Amino acid sequence: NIINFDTSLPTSHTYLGADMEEFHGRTLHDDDSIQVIPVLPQVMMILVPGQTLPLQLFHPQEVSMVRNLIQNDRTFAVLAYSNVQEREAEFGTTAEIYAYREEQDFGIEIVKVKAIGRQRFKVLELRTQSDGIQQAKVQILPEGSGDAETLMDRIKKQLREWDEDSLPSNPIDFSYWVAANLPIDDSLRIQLLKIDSAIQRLRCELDIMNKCTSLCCKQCQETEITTKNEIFSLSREGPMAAYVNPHGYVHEILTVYKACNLNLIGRPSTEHSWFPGYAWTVAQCKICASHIGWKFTATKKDMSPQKFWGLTRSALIPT
Numbered sequence: 001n002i003i004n005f006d007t008s009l010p011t012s013h014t015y016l017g018a019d020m021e022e023f024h025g026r027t028l029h030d031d032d033s034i035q036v037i038p039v040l041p042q043v044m045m046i047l048v049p050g051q052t053l054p055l056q057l058f059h060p061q062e063v064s065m066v067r068n069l070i071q072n073d074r075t076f077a078v079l080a081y082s083n084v085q086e087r088e089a090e091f092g093t094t095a096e097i098y099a100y101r102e103e104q105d106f107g108i109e110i111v112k113v114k115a116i117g118r119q120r121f122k123v124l125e126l127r128t129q130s131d132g133i134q135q136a137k138v139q140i141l142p143e144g145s146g147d148a149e150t151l152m153d154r155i156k157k158q159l160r161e162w163d164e165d166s167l168p169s170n171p172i173d174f175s176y177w178v179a180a181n182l183p184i185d186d187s188l189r190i191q192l193l194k195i196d197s198a199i200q201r202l203r204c205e206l207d208i209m210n211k212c213t214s215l216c217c218k219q220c221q222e223t224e225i226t227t228k229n230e231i232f233s234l235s236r237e238g239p240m241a242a243y244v245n246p247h248g249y250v251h252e253i254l255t256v257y258k259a260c261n262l263n264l265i266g267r268p269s270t271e272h273s274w275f276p277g278y279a280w281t282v283a284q285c286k287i288c289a290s291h292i293g294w295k296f297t298a299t300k301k302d303m304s305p306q307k308f309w310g311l312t313r314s315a316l317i318p319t
């Protein structure tokens with residue numbers, strides 16, 4: 001309930017690298033325009049405009065694609081797969097690289113990037129080259145706003161009950177902040193993205209956060225892991241942010257203060273820690289033993305909070 005922590009520290013993704021080449025030029029595709037944007041193969045998430053996405057690529061094809069993209073408009077396509085295994089996606093969001101680093105070592109050539117969601121699109125064609133790089137023929141969607149600040153002042157009211165402003169004031173920007181930080185599942189995330197007007201998004205987004213109770217283990221159905229009132233915001237991105245592990249896997253985690261039915265595996269560690277100053281420990285379900293997230297404990301008595309949890313969306317479902 002008290003915070004001694006640079007909340008703007010997790011957004012920097014210091015674990016990735018000390019200093020990376022920043023990029024300031026901004027590409028924004030005109031409304032209803034048809035573009036050919038390449039797709040990163042391993043990324044399997046629902047990206048929201050403004051959501052930051054970190055990446056660590058080791059395959060020579062991914063390195064060759066992003067090395068090429070850096071010299072151009074630095075924009076790749078993140079599809080919102082309707083079925084993950086079937087590669088079936090009809091919508092998606094563009095991602096613009098704003099940070100980049102070329103590290104060798106480990107015998108391989110690596111590229112670490114930090115992208116951010118820009119604009120949604122409707123997929124027209126999804127064609128794969130002979131090498132393997134997937135290219136997407138997409139149609140940029142238009143961004144409608146509207147006059148309904150009462151809806152924003154109602155979202156902000158229930159948001160502050162679960163955690164104690166500094167939120168976006170733009171009705172459009174705030175509509176996507178809510179879409180990226182609410183503990184909703186993928187199917188609901190797509191419904192928010194398919195919505196065109198911010199008024200519909202904000203009016204809809206009000207409808208779910210009243211029907212959202214608690215989060216339970218996916219493999220277990222009825223194992224209450226945390227409630228909608230334990231949400232803690234330790235980052236400027238909010239209570240929901242994406243972080244990449246040493247292997248390159250992106251985890252969309254949620255920061256909560258109290259969690260139940262969780263077993264910690266081993267002793268705390270500070271290696272590659274996503275929250276500088278804290279140590280991590282693998283948290284597992286008590287019954288089914290499926291990985292739920294990580295327990296973060298402070299390494300100093302001067303900082304606060306002393307403990308919190310970061311659980312991934314892929315292991316939890318609302319109930």
Ligand SMILES: O=C1C[C@]2(CCN(S(=O)(=O)NC3CCN(CCNC(=O)c4cccc(-c5cn6cc(C(=O)NC7CCC7)ccc6n5)c4)CC3)C2)C(=O)N1
Binds near residue numbers: 274294
């Ligand atoms: O603050 C933060 C938070 C964290 C801290 C670190 N994480 S974590 O995501 O890395 N680890 C978590 C914990 C492990 N997983 C749950 C349990 N295991 C499983 O279910 C499971 C099932 C089947 C296969 C495997 C598996 C593990 N293997 C490791 C290697 C490898 O090369 N090992 C060497 C290099 C290190 C020695 C190779 C093959 C491989 N197969 C595992 C979930 C991921 C995030 C961070 O990075 N920063």
Ligand SMILES: [Zn+2]
Binds near residue numbers: 217
């Ligand atoms: Zn379980």
